[PDB]
Design an enzyme around this catalytic site. Structure first.
Site, mmCIF file in Angstrom:
data_model
loop_
_atom_site.group_PDB
_atom_site.id
_atom_site.type_symbol
_atom_site.label_atom_id
_atom_site.label_comp_id
_atom_site.label_asym_id
_atom_site.label_seq_id
_atom_site.Cartn_x
_atom_site.Cartn_y
_atom_site.Cartn_z
ATOM 1 C CG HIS B 41 -0.405 0.068 2.530
ATOM 2 N ND1 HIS B 41 0.016 1.265 3.078
ATOM 3 C CD2 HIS B 41 -0.170 -0.876 3.467
ATOM 4 C CE1 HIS B 41 0.485 1.049 4.297
ATOM 5 N NE2 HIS B 41 0.401 -0.243 4.550
ATOM 6 N N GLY B 143 3.246 5.635 9.623
ATOM 7 C CA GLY B 143 4.556 5.556 8.986
ATOM 8 C C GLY B 143 5.398 4.352 9.370
ATOM 9 C CB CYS B 145 3.362 0.204 6.997
ATOM 10 S SG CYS B 145 1.762 0.312 7.839
HETATM 11 C C1 LIG Z 1 1.344 2.018 8.087
HETATM 12 N N1 LIG Z 1 2.253 2.887 8.237
HETATM 13 C C2 LIG Z 1 0.055 2.184 8.927
HETATM 14 C C3 LIG Z 1 0.378 1.805 10.382
HETATM 15 C C4 LIG Z 1 -0.797 2.138 11.373
HETATM 16 C C5 LIG Z 1 -1.226 3.420 11.367
HETATM 17 C C6 LIG Z 1 -2.183 3.767 12.446
HETATM 18 C C7 LIG Z 1 -1.652 3.568 13.758
HETATM 19 N N2 LIG Z 1 -1.004 2.162 13.970
HETATM 20 C C8 LIG Z 1 -0.546 1.423 12.766
HETATM 21 O O1 LIG Z 1 -0.055 0.331 12.832
HETATM 22 N N3 LIG Z 1 -0.944 1.287 8.335
HETATM 23 C C9 LIG Z 1 -2.234 1.780 7.872
HETATM 24 O O2 LIG Z 1 -2.569 2.913 8.011
HETATM 25 C C10 LIG Z 1 -3.131 0.755 7.254
HETATM 26 C C11 LIG Z 1 -3.289 0.749 5.881
HETATM 27 C C12 LIG Z 1 -4.665 1.306 5.492
HETATM 28 C C13 LIG Z 1 -5.437 1.554 6.860
HETATM 29 N N4 LIG Z 1 -4.613 1.040 7.815
HETATM 30 C C14 LIG Z 1 -4.926 0.805 9.202
HETATM 31 O O3 LIG Z 1 -4.083 0.373 9.924
HETATM 32 C C15 LIG Z 1 -6.359 1.141 9.630
HETATM 33 N N5 LIG Z 1 -6.874 -0.116 10.075
HETATM 34 C C16 LIG Z 1 -8.150 -0.573 9.517
HETATM 35 O O4 LIG Z 1 -8.718 0.096 8.714
HETATM 36 C C17 LIG Z 1 -8.723 -1.897 9.996
HETATM 37 F F1 LIG Z 1 -7.822 -2.431 10.875
HETATM 38 F F2 LIG Z 1 -9.888 -1.651 10.691
HETATM 39 C C18 LIG Z 1 -6.378 2.285 10.664
HETATM 40 C C19 LIG Z 1 -5.772 1.890 12.026
HETATM 41 C C20 LIG Z 1 -7.868 2.694 10.882
HETATM 42 C C21 LIG Z 1 -5.635 3.485 10.029
HETATM 43 C C22 LIG Z 1 -4.155 0.027 4.816
HETATM 44 C C23 LIG Z 1 -3.647 0.109 3.377
HETATM 45 C C24 LIG Z 1 -4.880 -1.230 5.370
#
Ligand SMILES: *C(=N)[C@H](C[C@@H]1CCCNC1=O)NC(=O)[C@@H]1[C@@H]2[C@H](CN1C(=O)[C@@H](NC(=O)C(F)F)C(C)(C)C)C2(C)C
Ligand SMILES: *C(=N)[C@H](C[C@@H]1CCCNC1=O)NC(=O)[C@@H]1[C@@H]2[C@H](CN1C(=O)[C@@H](NC(=O)C(F)F)C(C)(C)C)C2(C)C
Lengths: 306, 306
Positions: B41, B143, B145
């Protein structure tokens, strides 16, 4: 979110560990530029350690008696001296992996990471706090002496601890990197006891702020308190007095959450008087006092080092 | 003595982290030989992440759209492909710091260290367990990930986890390094829930053995139990069944302490039925299940890596 007992990345320090052998005793040393720092009792036999005269023992050694190995490569020793409880071996090769570094003497209540090492190789890394009684609650076996504790700030490694010994109840004692012991301990195998510990109040408050930032808010009450009143309660439960300096350091967390330090003191006071009643905070059933305010800020804001 | 939540030394992995930017999205990548692995992503805008078609989004990108930096040095991308939920960027420079490594898919109950990173730089290291519901209880911010989890064995780094997302109650989900999610999760921003967790029984037993080795023995009772009887009790308290495989893995700790696995099961059974009564084990007021039998052996025997 989430909150974990996080250690600093150890790579910069892993590049500095070596093994130091004198006679049949082997421990860890720290190789920075062209000097190796290690505990002076590497020059002791088993029997020597009951009542050693280190100055006497060192007089009888010469450079070549110290076997220093970085991995399998022997580093030739070209000079030696003793500074308090640490030996400094000058070697004929500077460590090319030496980071920017400082030697610091930390204060009780401050935290650092330990890189636990055996025979000059790292076993693991964990976070520790210097307790108010100048011990640390570590994990150290035979051969771990010379393992170091450190903090990092951007690119600069502050070495604050060298490991020397274990005390009766499985706690640990050591020196700064100029060889001076934290606390009243000596590097001799004789019965020694740490003083009574106390809880690091400013750190407990920092951790309650970490809880609020992570959404664990059940313990927040509607009250406030004076600094003086709070410290009367804390004394009874063996908590350190909270000072205005501590209040000021908690300022950033207070401003982030909108919770005044004295309001969070009122919440802590209720926890101390009533307990937590089967409930957890940040997954813990006990109040945690090994995160400083700066550790909470670092972890909750994603500060990096590289 | 002492027993701490110990992480692996992170140096070997710190040498492999880079920053990957596509458009305005930046996350971490893992640079091994001439390939950079990162979450797919990175090719998403904010809006894309509600319901992305990654294959569609990737068709519209070319090599030069991926900005890869190792420190401040840009690594030129000369090819790209997608393997499940991970992107593989071929670069024109092999990482000279690449350790011996493997990609492994870990099993629930196994532990690993996480090197939490932002913009390609490490923030901290901590130990985690893959929960029975395929989540981990981490500490991750925006950030993070592309941060990876790993184990080390002598000189070989086994990468087992890449971080992708956070789930409702502040727990975390990710993939192995071939891009396959642990658990039923998908990399899409939509409401997703982890299943009910369970306690990793073999790990609780390992930790009780660690307690005995460290001299914390109050919970040992005079009884034994059958495997079948124990598992009937454990079910009621949401503990995983204990299998003969688990018994065999606990063998080394059993032999060290002289306490048969089924005798220590009788002691655990009493703790589950009666609680710990205000008392702690290894400083904890709760039973700990994030140390494997191998972690206990490693820490209590001083295993190193270098
Ligand atoms: C990557 N850098 C982030 C790491 C997150 C960010 C929020 C705080 N803690 C973490 O680990 N990953 C994402 O943002 C990730 C990405 C987008 C949405 N997402 C989520 O983690 C979302 N989770 C959900 O939607 C689900 F678990 F219900 C939240 C936490 C709502 C942003 C994708 C591409 C899955
Ligand atoms: C250095 N490698 C060891 C590390 C110890 C070893 C035991 C387990 N945990 C550790 O941290 N340091 C020593 O062995 C050290 C050396 C000798 C005696 N000593 C001790 O730690 C001893 N402590 C005391 O005697 C005192 F604390 F009561 C014990 C634990 C009894 C070996 C000297 C030179 C002080």
């Amino acid at each position: 979110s989430g909150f974990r007992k996080m250690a600093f990345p150890s790579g910069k320090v892993e590049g500095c560990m070596v093994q130091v052998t004198c006679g049949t005793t082997t421990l860890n040393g720290l190789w920075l530029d062209d000097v190796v720092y290690c505990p002076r009792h590497v020059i002791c036999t088993s029997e020597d350690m009951l009542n050693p005269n280190y100055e006497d023992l060192l007089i009888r050694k010469s450079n070549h008696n110290f076997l220093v190995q970085a991995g399998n490569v022997q580093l030739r020793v070209i000079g030696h001296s003793m500074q308090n409880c640490v030996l400094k071996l000058k070697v004929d090769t500077a460590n090319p992996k030496t980071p920017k570094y400082k030697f610091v003497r930390i204060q009780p209540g401050q935290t650092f990471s330990v890189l636990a090492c055996y025979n000059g190789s790292p076993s693991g890394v964990y976070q520790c706090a210097m307790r108010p009684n100048f011990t640390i609650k570590g994990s150290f076996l035979n051969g771990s002496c010379g393992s170091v504790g450190f903090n990092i700030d951007y690119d600069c490694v502050s070495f604050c601890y060298m490991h020397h010994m274990e005390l009766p109840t499985g706690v640990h004692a050591g020196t700064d990197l100029e060889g001076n012991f934290y606390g009243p301990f000596v590097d001799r195998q004789t019965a020694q006891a740490a003083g009574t510990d106390t809880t690091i109040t400013v750190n407990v408050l920092a951790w309650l702020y970490a809880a609020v930032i992570n959404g664990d808010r059940w313990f927040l009450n509607r009250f406030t308190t004076t600094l003086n009143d709070f410290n009367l309660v804390a004394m009874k439960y063996n908590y350190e007095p909270l000072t205005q300096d501590h209040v000021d350091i908690l300022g950033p967390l207070s401003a982030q959450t909108g919770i005044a330090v004295l309001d969070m003191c009122a919440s802590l006071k209720e926890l101390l008087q009533n307990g937590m009643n089967g409930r957890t905070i940040l997954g813990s059933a006990l109040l945690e006092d090994e995160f400083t305010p700066f550790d909470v800020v670092r972890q909750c804001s994603g500060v990096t080092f590289q």
